[PDB]
Every structure is written in structure tokens, then in C-alpha cells.
Amino acid sequence: STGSATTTPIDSLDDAYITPVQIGTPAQTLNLDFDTGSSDLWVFSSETTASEVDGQTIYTPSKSTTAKLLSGATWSISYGDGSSSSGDVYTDTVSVGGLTVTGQAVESAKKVSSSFTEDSTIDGLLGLAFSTLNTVSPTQQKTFFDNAKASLDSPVFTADLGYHAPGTYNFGFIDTTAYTGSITYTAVSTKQGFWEWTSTGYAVGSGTFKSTSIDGIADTGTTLLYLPATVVSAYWAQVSGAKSSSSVGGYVFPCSATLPSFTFGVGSARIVIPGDYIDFGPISTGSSSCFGGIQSSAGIGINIFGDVALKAAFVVFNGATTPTLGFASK
Numbered sequence: 001s002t003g004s005a006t007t008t009p010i011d012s013l014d015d016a017y018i019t020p021v022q023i024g025t026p027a028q029t030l031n032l033d034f035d036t037g038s039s040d041l042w043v044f045s046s047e048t049t050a051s052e053v054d055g056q057t058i059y060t061p062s063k064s065t066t067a068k069l070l071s072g073a074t075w076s077i078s079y080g081d082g083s084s085s086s087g088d089v090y091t092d093t094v095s096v097g098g099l100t101v102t103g104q105a106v107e108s109a110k111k112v113s114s115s116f117t118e119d120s121t122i123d124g125l126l127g128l129a130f131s132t133l134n135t136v137s138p139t140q141q142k143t144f145f146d147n148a149k150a151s152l153d154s155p156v157f158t159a160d161l162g163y164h165a166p167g168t169y170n171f172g173f174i175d176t177t178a179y180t181g182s183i184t185y186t187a188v189s190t191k192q193g194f195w196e197w198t199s200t201g202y203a204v205g206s207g208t209f210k211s212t213s214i215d216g217i218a219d220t221g222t223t224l225l226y227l228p229a230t231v232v233s234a235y236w237a238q239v240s241g242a243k244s245s246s247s248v249g250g251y252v253f254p255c256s257a258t259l260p261s262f263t264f265g266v267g268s269a270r271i272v273i274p275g276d277y278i279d280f281g282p283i284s285t286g287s288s289s290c291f292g293g294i295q296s297s298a299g300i301g302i303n304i305f306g307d308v309a310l311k312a313a314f315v316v317f318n319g320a321t322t323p324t325l326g327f328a329s330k
Contacts, residue, residue: 001099001148001151001152001153001172002098002099002152002153002170002171002173003096003097003099003170003171003172004169004170004171005020005096005097006020006167006168007034007161007166007168007169008166009162009164009165010119010121010122012164012281013223013281014161014163014223015223016122016223017161017167017307018033018123019031019032019033019096019126021094021095021096023043023059023092023094023106024059024061024064024065024066024067024092025064025065025092025093026064028060028064029057030043030057030059030124031057031121031122032122032123032124032126033125033126033221034159034169034220034221035125035126035127035219035220035221036195036217036218036221037080037129037194037217037219037220037221037304038077038079038127038133039129039132039133039135039143039193040075040125040133040135040136041104041105041106041124041125041126041144042075042077042087042106042107042108042124042125043058043059043106043107043108043109043123044056044057044058044116044123044124045059045060045061045108045109046060046062047087047088047109047110048109048112049110049111049112052116053117054117054120055120056120056122056123056124059106059108059124061092061108064090066102067091067106068090068092069088070088070089070090070105070136070139072138073089073136073138073139073141074086074087074088074136074137075088075089075107075134075135075136075137076135082113082115083113083116084111084112085109086109086110086111087107087108087110089105089106089136089141090105091103091105092104092106094106094144096126096144096169097169097171099148099151099171099172101147101148104144104147105134105141107136109124126144127143127144128143128144128145128220128317129143130194131143132190132193133194145157145319146319148172149319152172153172153173154172154173155172155319155320156171156172156173156174156319156320157170157172157316157317158170158178158316158317159310159314159317160175160315161220161310163274163277163311174316178314179314179328179329180330181328181329182269183316183328184267184268184269184328185318185324185325186266186267186324186326186327187324188323188324188325192217192302194217194302195217195317195323195325196216196217196302197215197217197218198214198215198216199213199215199216199264199266200267200268201214201264201265202227202262202265203262203270204235204238204263205260205261205275206260207238209263209265211265214227214231214264217302217303217304218305218315218317218325219304219310220306220307220310222304222306223280223293223306223307223308224293224295224304224306225278225295225305225306225308225309226295226297226300226302226304226306227294227295227296227297227303228296228303229296229298232251232294232296235294236251238260239253239260241253242254242257242292244296248283248289248291250295250296251291251292251296252289252291252292253289254288254289255287255288256288260275261274262275262294264309266325271309271313271327271329272312272329273308273309277293277311277312278292278294279292279293293308294308312329313327313328313329314327315327316328
């Protein structure tokens with residue numbers, strides 16, 4: 001089997017991407033944030049505290065003939081941005097882009113944090129990191145990908161995120177029309193439950209490439225590129241008037257600037273992030289200070305190749321017995 005679904009930016013900044021997902025029978029279509037940095041498929045639901053729902057589409061298990069309570073099971077998750085959600089669990093049929101999994105754990109939110117409530121466009125998350133991070137207790141559950149894997153034509157999914165445009169998540173095949181040149185594969189460590197890999201270095205604009213190992217995760221659920229402070233300082237030093245603002249919470253730059261590109265290494269290959277991908281616009285409406293898309297990881301504990309980096313590439317998440325990542329230009 002295969003599946004193929006379009007993923008759409010939620011706003012003009014590409015802050016996140018939503019992908020329609022069919023849950024239950026008859027289908028209930030929710031728009032989920034596919035997150036390769038987490039491992040829970042959770043949804044706004046008929047159980048979510050009413051004051052915490054503001055425009056999201058909800059899953060109502062009582063209207064699904066295939067829903068079954070997963071008796072005793074609860075979940076609770078906290079993300080890198082400080083957001084959180086928790087609740088109970090149903091199993092149900094879940095389809096993405098024509099690919100169906102029966103008996104998928106659908107984590108029904110009873111509570112969500114303010115950032116979720118305030119984002120009417122995201123109806124929940126679909127985690128695509130390793131199932132070892134799933135938070136269901138007392139019986140840990142598998143991701144949609146892990147449950148689909150054995151049925152897929154190839155044990156892979158691919159992320160093809162757009163810059164200010166829709167893109168695609170494919171499951172079970174590699175669309176050889178979706179990228180240019182060849183795919184460079186790189187090793188993955190699953191020790192922390194992430195798609196963790198080691199970049200071979202970086203360049204700023206037209207500058208020389210710096211060979212240096214940067215361990216980090218491929219995380220579709222994180223908007224920005226978070227790298228070591230040395231790398232980030234070297235980038236923003238090429239932008240007149242850029243500075244790190246403790247009040248704003250990262251590097252800002254004059255909205256009048258033209259940003260340089262940023263290149264990262266994948267083995268001997270290079271992915272170039274155009275400068276415009278690094279512009280996240282005014283810090284507040286009408287400001288002439290703009291927020292940068294490359295930020296320091298130093299207060300996180302991990303480097304994160306988030307959407308800013310991933311949307312410059314066609315990315316293969318190879319879930320074979322020995323997982324690997326692949327990157328191609330596009």
C-alpha cells in the first residue's frame with residue numbers, strides 16, 4: 001500500500017503545516033500537524049474541556065462505529081515550546097492520503113494548553129518520531145507509521161514541505177519526480193526516539209563551507225532551524241543590524257534587510273536554504289524589526305532541523321530495520 005496527502009501551511013509565515021486525516025466510520029476529517037519530533041496522534045475531541053476549544057474540528061468517538069475505548073489508557077505530553085495536552089485513548093480506523101490503519105490509537109484530548117486553543121487551524125498532532133516516545137500509559141502505543149509499515153510497499157515516508165505553498169507527505173514510496181539530482185542518505189540514531197542525524201557542516205551565503213559535525217533532529221513539528229550559538233552568530237553577523245534580543249526571545253533583524261542563504265551538509269551533499277526562507281516577518285504587527293528563522297539551540301539541549309531547513313529539501317524518513325534519513329534538493 002501507499003498513501004499521499006497534501007500538507008498546507010496554516011498561515012502566511014509557514015508557522016506549521018496541516019494535513020487532512022480521516023478518523024472513524026463514517027470518516028471524520030481533522031487537519032493534523034504531522035510531527036516527526038513526537039510520537040502521539042492526539043486530537044481535539046468531544047471530550048476536550050469546552051473553554052479550551054476555539055474553532056477546531058473535533059473527533060467524536062461516540063459517532064464512530066469503529067471507535068473503541070482503550071480501557072485504562074491515558075496520555076500526557078509536553079512539547080519543546082512549553083505547550084501540552086492530555087486525555088484518554090480510543091482505537092479507531094485512521095486514513096492518510098488513501099492509506100488506512102485499523103486499530104490506531106487516537107489520543108482524545110481532555111485538556112490542551114493555551115497555544116493549542118489559540119490555533120484554530122490545528123485539530124491535533126500526528127506523531128512520526130519513533131514509538132518509544134509515545135506517552136500512552138500503561139501500554140505504550142505505536143505511531144501511524146509504525147502501524148502502517150508492514151503494509152507499505154517500502155517502509156518509508158517522505159516530507160516535501162512547501163515555501164509559502166502546499167507540499168506533500170507520501171507513505172510507502174519515493175516520488176522520483178519530486179526532487180532534483182540524487183538523494184543523499186545519512187545515518188540515524190534512534191537512542192532519543194527522534195530522527196537524529198549528524199550534518200557535516202554549513203556555509204553562510206556565498207561563504208566557504210565549514211566542515212563540522214552538527215547532531216540534530218529532523219522535526220517537521222518545529223517551525224525554525226535551531227543550531228549551535230557559534231553557527232547562528234556566524235549567520236546573523238552577515239546581516240547589518242541583526243542582533244539577539246532577550247526581550248523578543250531570539251535574533252531579530254531589520255525588515256529592510258536582504259538575508260543570505262544558509263547551506264547545511266548532508267554527507268558530501270549540500271542543501272541550500274534561500275535567505276527568504278529565514279524571514280519570519282515583523283515581531284509584532286507593523287514593526288520594522290523582523291524575526292529570524294535561524295535561532296540558537298543553546299537553551300534547548302538539541303539542535304533542530306525544523307521546517308525552515310526541511311522545506312528546502314525532499315526528505316526521506318527511511319523506517320527500515322536500520323533507519324536512515326535522505327535529503328535531496330528540489
